[PDB]
Design a binder for this molecule. Structure first.
Ligand SMILES: CC1=C(/C=C/C(C)=C\C=C/C(C)=C/C=O)C(C)(C)CCC1
Length: 250
């Protein structure tokens, strides 16, 4: 069958490229040796069975793990569960009109000293790994809704550029085939500085996927159905509770 052959070919390419000794190629081979066929199919299907292109995606996925080992080295599924239970980030039970998974983040009362930026990116990665087991999601991908209504100057001033860059690379290196859009709502005037800091690190393809809505959600609701969003993201569903998602994943 085509799938098993495609997976085999990808594996062969991984080995062939590693044989050159090129640093990244060698790391890919080492980092995927425990993976099942399902893992390789995510990349293959995301690139319409084009093996070389699937391999290019795989390189970025591994590169992210090489550059940010602190996110992966001592990952504890139990600790990640607690982060998710606390609502960071969230996940909608329904897909949007594009058939995408919708992820959520509400910065209001986020306290970086209780739940770190890194801990939240670990939760993103943990969730995405699970979600990407699903074959429709492997094609449709996901989006992110950021409610910045409660973004304080204190939070703004404390955001580390290195952390913002880590998030950029998560979307641009680890998950570019699947990250489709990010929608910022209710952001304050000083969001402009924060955006300006990240801008130089964004490829043009990624910039095209960033939307900033302020207080006018008319266009936002054309994209994400109001009737599938929690009340704290402008929707008609109950206030987002991380416990439900947590129980579904674990
Ligand atoms: C503008 C913009 C970004 C900004 C993200 C910021 C501003 C905050 C992220 C969330 C935080 C604060 C999470 C805390 O745990 C990205 C997504 C990096 C890249 C695309 C453009």
């Amino acid at each position: 069958e085509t799938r098993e052959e495609a997976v085999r070919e990808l594996q062969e390419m991984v080995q062939a490229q590693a044989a050159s000794g090129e640093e990244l190629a060698v790391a890919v081979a080492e980092r995927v040796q425990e993976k099942d066929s399902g893992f390789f199919l995510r990349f293959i299907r995301a690139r319409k069975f084009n093996v070389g292109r699937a391999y290019e995606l795989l390189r970025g996925y591994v590169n992210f793990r090489l550059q940010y080992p602190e996110l992966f080295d001592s990952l504890s599924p139990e600790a990640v569960r607690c982060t998710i239970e606390a609502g960071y980030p969230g996940v909608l039970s329904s897909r949007d009109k594009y058939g995408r998974v919708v992820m959520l983040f509400n910065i209001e009362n986020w306290q970086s000293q209780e739940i770190t930026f890194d801990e939240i990116l670990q939760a993103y990665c943990f969730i995405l790994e699970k979600l990407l087991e699903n074959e429709e999601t492997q094609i449709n991908g996901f989006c992110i809704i950021e409610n910045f209504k409660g973004f304080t100057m204190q939070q703004a001033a404390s955001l580390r550029t290195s952390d913002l860059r880590k998030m950029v690379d998560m979307l641009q290196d680890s998950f570019p085939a699947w990250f489709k859009a990010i929608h910022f709502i209710h952001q304050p005037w000083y969001f402009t500085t924060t955006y300006n800091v990240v801008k130089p690190f964004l490829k043009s393809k990624l910039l095209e996927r960033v939307f900033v809505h302020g207080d006018d959600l008319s266009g936002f609701y054309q994209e994400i159905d109001e009737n599938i969003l929690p009340s704290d993201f402008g929707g008609t569903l109950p206030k987002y509770d991380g416990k439900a998602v947590a129980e579904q994943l674990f």
